[PDB]
From Swiss-Prot:
<comment type="similarity">
    <text>Belongs to the GlnE family.</text>
</comment>
<keyword id="KW-0808">Transferase</keyword>
<comment type="function">
    <text>Involved in the regulation of glutamine synthetase GlnA, a key enzyme in the process to assimilate ammonia. When cellular nitrogen levels are high, the C-terminal adenylyl transferase inactivates GlnA by covalent transfer of an adenylyl group from ATP to 'Tyr-398' of GlnA, thus reducing its activity. Conversely, when nitrogen levels are low, the N-terminal adenylyl removase (AR) activates GlnA by removing the adenylyl group by phosphorolysis, increasing its activity. The regulatory region of GlnE binds the signal transduction protein PII (GlnB) which indicates the nitrogen status of the cell.</text>
</comment>
<keyword id="KW-0547">Nucleotide-binding</keyword>
<dbReference type="GO" id="GO:0000287">
    <property type="term" value="F:magnesium ion binding"/>
</dbReference>
<dbReference type="GO" id="GO:0005524">
    <property type="term" value="F:ATP binding"/>
</dbReference>
<feature type="region of interest" description="Adenylyl transferase">
    <location>
        <begin position="1"/>
        <end position="497"/>
    </location>
</feature>
<dbReference type="GO" id="GO:0008882">
    <property type="term" value="F:[glutamate-ammonia-ligase] adenylyltransferase activity"/>
</dbReference>
<dbReference type="GO" id="GO:0005829">
    <property type="term" value="C:cytosol"/>
</dbReference>
<protein>
    <recommendedName>
        <fullName>Bifunctional glutamine synthetase adenylyltransferase/adenylyl-removing enzyme</fullName>
        <ecNumber>2.7.7.89</ecNumber>
        <ecNumber>2.7.7.42</ecNumber>
    </recommendedName>
</protein>
<keyword id="KW-0548">Nucleotidyltransferase</keyword>
<keyword id="KW-0511">Multifunctional enzyme</keyword>
<keyword id="KW-0460">Magnesium</keyword>
<dbReference type="GO" id="GO:0047388">
    <property type="term" value="F:[glutamine synthetase]-adenylyl-L-tyrosine phosphorylase activity"/>
</dbReference>
<comment type="subunit">
    <text>Monomer.</text>
</comment>
<dbReference type="GO" id="GO:0000820">
    <property type="term" value="P:regulation of glutamine family amino acid metabolic process"/>
</dbReference>
<dbReference type="GO" id="GO:0062132">
    <property type="term" value="P:regulation of L-glutamine biosynthetic process"/>
</dbReference>
């Protein structure tokens, strides 16, 4: 125990011969000693006060004894001191680290396992709350209780206070991401379920953002007056991309478009009367603002709205009737492709019905088979020239031949080709369930649809692991040769012949 105290006290001496570091390699011991020295020098540089220095001197022998005894000492300590350096100014956070040896133990365990978590806890130290209860730290929220949990997390927050409401949503998201990532790392949640949890989480957040925006708008303008005879809001959020496709990762954007079904002559019913439609545009804008603005705990989600009709040049919100017109009369095939993946993530039953029937009608357009196949193949190839890692010796899991986008395009291709003949193909928007549908409806043999499913979930789940390690989305060309061969052969089967 004395020797751990000395490792901290004689830190600057960087004594090579300390027994406590003998288990490590020369280089690793060298790195460990430097890390400790470097940290101690920061204290002198950040000129922290007496209370801080007292807690640190108590806490560091203990902290170093856990970390530095690990085989992975050098990497682990590097992640821990980056975290500490960020919080050495907050006495309370140190005080919490000392008063609770169990929260420290999990901090070290997690940071050793995952630089993603280390970074998050370094960026958002208020998450240290989560480390004080292993029962919740490693059991993430039931997929159907995200809305209830948010509700309960928002109780303390002044409902009149935009900035606190915003900050609270950001806190909630980071807490849930930590729990999700922590359960993955502990094996408490199967990796197969990570995208599922992230997706349920985003939907809860969307629900709460819309709610917050609506209250602000209704307070300024009153309600659009067409909303009689009608329980709900006449506004809809459609999710595209990974959101649509139940494929969210830890640091994903949300691809969203916004619909209304508001008449031209509708007005809001407050004394600050505005046009019904402008009320929704402003609603949409507020929502964007509530997702993207930066508070202490960062931003909530980056929102990408570029897939709306006409892209960046289109209205921020379209009527459902204009969305239908556009899809039938103007949209490119690549837009219809993208639409295979779209689903309503917020809206009332009327507008959901409107979207569903519109999309269903676009899916089941009769399309000339080879013309479509030619279109989808040409588009894939153009994407591949611009997207993903461009190095020959690497395999971009998403972007390269035999990767995820290949599978996605195979599924979108087949729904657009065959939905006219087999309308049940429209029923789900994610790859796993689309492949299932393609088998049930005799487009694809069961062996193939299952082989694409597994290759898909394997590749998608690798990306989750890579995220956890703050590694890029490309791996050695040695990797996943069976998955790629099977996806290439399907590509060749469906898209080239």
């Amino acid at each position: 125990s004395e020797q751990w105290r000395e490792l901290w006290q004689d830190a600057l001496q960087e004594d090579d011969t300390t027994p406590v570091l003998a288990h490590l390699s020369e280089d690793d011991r060298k790195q460990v000693l430097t890390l400790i020295a470097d940290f101690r020098k920061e204290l002198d540089k950040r000129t922290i006060g007496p209370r801080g220095r007292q807690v640190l001197d108590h806490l560091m022998p203990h902290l170093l004894s856990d970390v530095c005894a690990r085989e992975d000492a050098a990497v682990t300590l590097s992640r821990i001191t980056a975290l500490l350096v960020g919080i050495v100014t907050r006495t309370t956070y140190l005080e919490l680290l000392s008063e609770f040896p169990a929260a420290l133990k999990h901090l070290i365990s997690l940071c050793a396992a995952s630089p993603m978590i280390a970074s998050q806890l370094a960026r958002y130290p208020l998450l240290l709350d989560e480390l004080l209860d292993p029962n919740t730290l490693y059991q993430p929220t039931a997929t159907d209780a995200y809305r209830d949990e948010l509700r309960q997390y928002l109780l303390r927050v002044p409902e009149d206070d935009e900035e606190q409401q915003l900050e609270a949503l950001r806190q909630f998201k980071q807490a849930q991401l930590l729990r999700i990532a922590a359960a993955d790392i502990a094996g408490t949640l199967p990796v197969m379920k990570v995208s599922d949890h992230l997706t349920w989480l985003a939907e809860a957040m969307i629900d709460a953002v819309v709610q917050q925006a609506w209250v602000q708008m209704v307070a300024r303008y009153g309600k659009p007056n067409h909303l009689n005879e009608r329980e709900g809001r006449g506004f809809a959020v459609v999710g595209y991309g990974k959101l649509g496709g139940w494929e969210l990762g830890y640091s994903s954007d949300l691809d969203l478009i916004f619909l209304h079904d508001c008449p031209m002559d509708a007005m809001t019913d407050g004394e600050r009367e505005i046009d019904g439609r402008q009320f929704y545009l402003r609603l949409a804008q507020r929502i964007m603002h509530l997702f993207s603005t930066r508070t202490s705990s960062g931003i909530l989600y980056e929102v990408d709205a570029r897939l709306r009709p006409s892209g960046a040049a289109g209205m921020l919100v379209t009527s459902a009737e204009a969305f239908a017109d556009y899809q039938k009369n103007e949209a490119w095939t690549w837009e219809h492709q993208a639409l295979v993946r779209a689903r309503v993530v917020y809206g009332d039953p009327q507008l959901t019905a409107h979207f569903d029937a519109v999309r269903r009608e676009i899916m089941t357009l009769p399309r000339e088979g080879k013309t479509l196949q030619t279109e989808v193949r040409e588009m894939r190839e153009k994407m591949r020239a611009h997207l993903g890692n461009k190095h020959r010796d690497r395999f971009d899991i998403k972007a390269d031949e035999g990767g995820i986008t290949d599978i996605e395009f195979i599924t979108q291709y087949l729904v657009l080709r065959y939905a006219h003949e087999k309308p049940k193909l429209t029923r789900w928007s994610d790859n796993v369930r689309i492949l299932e549908l393609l088998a049930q409806n005799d487009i694809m043999e069961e062996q193939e649809a299952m082989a694409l499913t597994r290759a898909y979930t394997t590749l998608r789940d690798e990306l989750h692991h890579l995220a956890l390690q703050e590694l890029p989305g490309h791996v050695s060309e040695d990797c996943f040769t069976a998955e790629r061969e099977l996806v290439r052969a399907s590509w060749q089967k469906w898209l080239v012949e």
